[PDB]
Structure 1
Amino acid sequence: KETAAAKFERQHMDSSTSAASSSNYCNQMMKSRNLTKDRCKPVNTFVHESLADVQAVCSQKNVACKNGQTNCYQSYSTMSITDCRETGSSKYPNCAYKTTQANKHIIVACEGNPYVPVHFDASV
């Protein structure tokens, strides 16, 4: 089984681009990070920052999670992100995503030793 930290990295990290690199970015990335294998993942955010910058957020501003948990952290600075959401024309096995680039604060849930991101909660 994949560790929680490894699943967070696979699903949410894309340090190799500064920003969503076209309207087809989400279709490409959702397949290659294997988020469309048995089912189209409906919603997913990619962060275009270093892994170290994202990991640093677990030491930034402690806020509530949407679920009421108390192990969420909001980035002090905005970060380049891309939101991917399935469109109405999406039907597995032909998944189809809208790509939305933005620069927002991120909110992540953290856990473990090392204390690292395990869940992407939200962006602001």
Structure 2
Amino acid sequence: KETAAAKFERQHMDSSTSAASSSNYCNQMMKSRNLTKDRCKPVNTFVHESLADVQAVCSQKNVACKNGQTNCYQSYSTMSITDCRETGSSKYPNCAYKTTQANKHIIVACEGNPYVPVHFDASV
């Protein structure tokens, strides 16, 4: 199995690099993280901050989740993130992505005991 928390780390945490290393980044990462195993996941965001920093967002600004739930939190500071988005040549099993770096606030849904990030909601 894999807990919601471990799953979030797998799909969204990349503390090794401070930014989107290169145009090749998303292609390597989406595959490496097993995000292109059952289909090409259309979009995915990686956060280049420490695990502790991202978990701390659960005690930050409480905001509404896109699905209407109220367990979402927005970071007070901007964080380094990389957006991975499908290219047109993208054809399963040959998934292709466009790597895009930016500094934005992240919004994550948190749950459990301890209270940790379980889902990436949005970035603003």
Q: TM-score, normalised by structure 1?
A: 0.99
Structure 1 CA distance for aligned equivalents of residues 45 and 114 of structure 2: 23
Q: Structure 1, residues 48-106: CA drift from partner, whole Å, max 9, x if none? A: 00000000000000000011100000000000000001111100111000111000000
Of all paired residues, the percent bearing the same amino acid is 100
SS of residue in 2 equivalent to 1:40: coil
Aligned residue pairs, count: 124
Gaps of 5+ in 2: none
How large is the Cα RMSD of the aligned pairs? 0.5
Gaps of 5+ in 1: none
Structure 1 position 18, deviation (Å): 0.3
Structure 1 CA distance for aligned equivalents of residues 93 and 67 of structure 2: 31
Is it true that 1:58 corresponds to 2:58 in the alignment?
A: yes
SS of residue in 1 equivalent to 2:119: strand
Structure 1 CA distance for aligned equivalents of residues 32 and 114 of structure 2: 27
Structure 1 position 38, deviation (Å): 2.0
Q: Which stretch has the larger CA shift, 34-43 or 49-58?
A: 34-43
Structure 1 CA distance for aligned equivalents of residues 67 and 35 of structure 2: 23
Structure 1 position 34, deviation (Å): 0.7
Structure 1 CA distance for aligned equivalents of residues 25 and 91 of structure 2: 18
